[PDB]
Amino acid sequence: AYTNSFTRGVYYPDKVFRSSVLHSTQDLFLPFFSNVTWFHNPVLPFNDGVYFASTEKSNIIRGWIFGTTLDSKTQSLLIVNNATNVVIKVCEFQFCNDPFNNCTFEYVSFKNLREFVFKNYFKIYSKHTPINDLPQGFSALEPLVDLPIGINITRFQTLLAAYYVGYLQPRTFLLKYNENGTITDAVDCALDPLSETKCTLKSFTVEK
């Protein structure tokens, strides 16, 4: 099934503070108003990078598996939440085809909307907010975690509820940095001719 992404999938694309400025940037961004694939289980392509969002009331989704094979033969990323702690590791794992060796990296520590950006080595950005099918709105995904792990990825899985997946693409986003340091609006310049105008002018209001 499918759902409109609306104005979501905006992440802080660098560790740089900027206030009261309209910073245009071109990188792996989620095309605005595109149709995210909608689920209430499967194995998915990763392409260049993934927006993953889930709406929950129940902590059903716990994490992810990533790689090219996803059935040993070479290294694969695993991320897992369980009880009191969260786990990250990159071994040449065997897995079930329905889950729910050379370990070069390892670590251990609806009413919720959770949102994540995964891109390549591997970087995690995210946001979490209360809600009460993906909501119309805007969010600023902060960088969380940097993994120097060197893993190739073309495919991925969810470890278990409503969740949504869409692929990031090399587009130009005009990001509005607010007061004491926060992203607060954006324009996807290729969206429509008024968005091409706002990115021509580098302005959120356009004169006659």
Partner: protein, 166 residues
Amino acid sequence: KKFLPFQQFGRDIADTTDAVRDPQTLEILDITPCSFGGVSVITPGTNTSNQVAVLYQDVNCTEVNVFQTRAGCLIGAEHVNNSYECDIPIGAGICASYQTSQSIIAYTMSLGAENSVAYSNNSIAIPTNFTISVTTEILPVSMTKTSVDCTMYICGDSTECSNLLL
């Protein structure tokens, strides 16, 4: 400043770095660039003196008989209350001149003599007499008709360069 916890560098409008987070202790440090400016040698003709004043453009005098100005720090000119006409211009309302026992002096220039006019709802002034006067006015009209032969400029005395100029 209030960088978000993951933000390490601050940037301004023109892509200048305006601040940085210290990586050991979570304080945000304003960066101001090192002070620089033009040095201006305010002088009468050497046909009059070897005294020169110096203006350090846009700088607190500390970093350089001294006067702080809107233009920068002025050294070697005396700050004078008397407003004359301009002689050597400085900026931001200031001019300077060489005057009497003689030094360079620096002052807010006067715009000329003031005059409250004797206006009333009944009085007129009328000239009983006149001066004819002759005033020169000078206007330039033409340049030197210069002409530079590009080839003999760029590759003068060389076909072996001219073959590349084409």
